[PDB]
Design an enzyme around this catalytic site. Structure first.
Site, short mmCIF file in Angstrom:
data_model
loop_
_atom_site.label_atom_id
_atom_site.label_comp_id
_atom_site.label_asym_id
_atom_site.label_seq_id
_atom_site.Cartn_x
_atom_site.Cartn_y
_atom_site.Cartn_z
N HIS A 25 0.79 -1.34 0.09
CA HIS A 25 0.02 -0.02 0.03
C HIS A 25 0.97 1.24 0.13
CE1 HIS A 25 -3.09 -2.51 2.21
NE2 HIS A 25 -3.43 -2.70 0.80
N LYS A 50 5.82 6.20 7.40
CA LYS A 50 5.48 4.98 8.42
C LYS A 50 6.59 4.57 9.22
CE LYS A 50 1.92 4.03 5.02
NZ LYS A 50 1.66 3.00 3.93
N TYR A 62 1.66 1.40 14.02
CA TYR A 62 2.35 2.00 13.03
C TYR A 62 2.03 3.67 13.32
CZ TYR A 62 -1.13 1.23 9.42
OH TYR A 62 -2.35 1.21 8.65
N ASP A 118 -6.49 -6.20 -2.19
CA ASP A 118 -5.06 -6.54 -2.02
C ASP A 118 -4.74 -7.89 -3.17
OD1 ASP A 118 -4.53 -4.70 -0.47
OD2 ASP A 118 -4.13 -5.81 1.22
#
EC number: 5.1.3.13
Lengths: 184, 184
Positions: B65, B74, B134, B171
């Site tokens: 992603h 991130k 995250y 996905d």
């Protein structure tokens, strides 16, 4: 706000956050922090310079800690097990000076407490183990850390314990609230 | 730096962090984030506006992603179980454009990966369950999220799997790397 709920506690600057969960225990996602929702709740911008992660056994009680220099706001939560988390208002002139609020924070309930600068903070582990995470607005300064003893008879904190807590020697030696220096 | 170690990966802007632990499994403390050590490592100031927390079962693979608008850095880690975490360089003109790096991040090893803006990110759960945290530098924008399929034959990512991963339909439908729009 779609990301979570915020509830002002009896000391209204202490805020209980509860994230919205998407999914369930076989697989989920939630926002544990959203700067827009947070700054809406506390009413001012906030930067977090340090995140901490601790693991503690049942009955361990850490606190009540604060530092007057490099005063820290703390956003705290439990990612494993369950704690009882306490904030004590030590701000000069506060109409709730010397009062406390406490909440059960657990990995299951995903609740968080925002404890502004000017408060002392402590928690006790209620589960077999607890892992405790917090985001803070200034760096920990061991040379500036103060302690008020957990069982201070004026604060009269209602710790949900049956057995005596396990303390570090420094926390066992915490000052009485009567004798504690507080925030300007 | 006293708080942790930082290691530049084969794509040197991807940084593997490993906090110093004080204590042991009966009771410990570590810094999971220190703004001074972080900004030293990546070389510029960074603000984190959103923290996420997910739980996933063995074999679940999320990714790959990225969002071109509201590009996100991130900082990721695992607080329960073990994942294999992957970053893919999608920056225009990067000498490592189209390369990937991957690391095992676990609750035990406490390792973290910094994945700058301009990268795609994914992970697969290796343990029975994994909880994945995250911190991100911009808000998630579902209307801007892009996906490159995990098993892209040009990327040739060495996922440490024996069984086929469990993917969301989106996905599963990720673009081929050949066809993916990338970062300006």
């Amino acid at each position: 706000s779609n990301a979570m709920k915020a509830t002002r506690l009896a000391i209204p600057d202490v805020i209980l956050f509860e994230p919205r969960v998407f999914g369930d225990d076989r697989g989920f996602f939630f926002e544990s922090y959203n700067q827009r929702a947070f700054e809406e709740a506390c009413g001012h911008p906030v930067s977090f310079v340090q995140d901490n992660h601790s693991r503690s056994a049942r009955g361990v009680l850490r606190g009540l800690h604060y530092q007057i220099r490099q005063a820290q706001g703390k956003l705290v939560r439990a990612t494993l097990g369950e704690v009882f988390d306490v904030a004590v208002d030590l701000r000069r002139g506060s109409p709730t000076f010397g009062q406390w609020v406490g909440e059960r924070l657990s990995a299951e309930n995903k609740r968080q407490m925002w404890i502004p600068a000017g408060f002392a903070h402590g928690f006790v582990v209620l589960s077999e183990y607890a892992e405790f995470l917090y985001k803070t607005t200034d760096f920990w300064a061991p040379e500036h850390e103060r302690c008020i003893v957990w069982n201070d008879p004026e604060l009269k904190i209602d710790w949900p314990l049956q057995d005596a807590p396990l303390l570090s020697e420094k926390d066992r030696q915490g000052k009485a609230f009567a004798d504690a220096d507080c925030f300007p």
